[PDB]
Amino acid sequence: MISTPEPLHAGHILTPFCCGVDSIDNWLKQRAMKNQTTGASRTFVCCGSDSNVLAYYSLASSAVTTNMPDPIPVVVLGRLAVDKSLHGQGVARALVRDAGLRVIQVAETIGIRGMLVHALSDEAREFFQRVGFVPSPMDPMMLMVTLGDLVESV
């Protein structure tokens, strides 16, 4: 059975994680623990029976601007992936909900106004649209949920 999303630490077992996208498997195994300690991003993991990561996603703080207006703080949803063992069962949708609830509970600290995600393929765009993200005016492969839509959704 899959544990509650918690911050990645050195006790989590990464090697067997396979979501079917090599680069996203590699990032978890090669870069995630380093990111976690340097504070580049914050990674959250679900575990199975033996501290083995079955799923993960990363959040980072970012800002949107133009051109000199004050940039808008946003949370960027980075990589998100589920072990193939758990595909087609609402786990990824539950990770997006987990991310959305984090964004709500932190939003007023530094004035987060929404959550963005960079779709890395047409497949990912379809998936992100399918759980409630919408294309941004900046880029059709850069999707968003407003803090307003998030808060009203709960």
Binding site: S58, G132, T146, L147, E152
Partner: protein, 86 residues
């Protein structure tokens, strides 16, 4: 779903360094370069701390942020569906 050719201007010394690295990894030259570019591209996009918008796109972005909250059905289902971790 079909394959495009990309011809890239490269110094021979730069090409020979990639061939040595591909050899060391037991990878074909094309896979070594494409896997390196894919990994770097996802990193470049995800790690953007400052996202720059064209001015017209930026004001539409601000319009949507301020708009009367209207969550679509997909987002409602995502946020109201209890997690497998209960």
């Amino acid at each position: 779903m079909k394959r495009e050719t990309l011809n890239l201007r490269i110094k021979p010394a730069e090409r020979d360094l990639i061939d040595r690295a591909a050899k060391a990894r037991g990878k074909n030259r094309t896979d070594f370069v494409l896997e390196a570019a894919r990994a770097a591209a996802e990193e470049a996009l995800i790690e953007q701390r400052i996202i720059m918008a064209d001015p017209e796109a930026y004001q539409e972005f601000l319009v949507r942020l301020d708009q009367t909250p209207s969550p679509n059905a997909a987002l409602r289902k995502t946020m109201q569906t209890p997690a497998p971790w209960e």
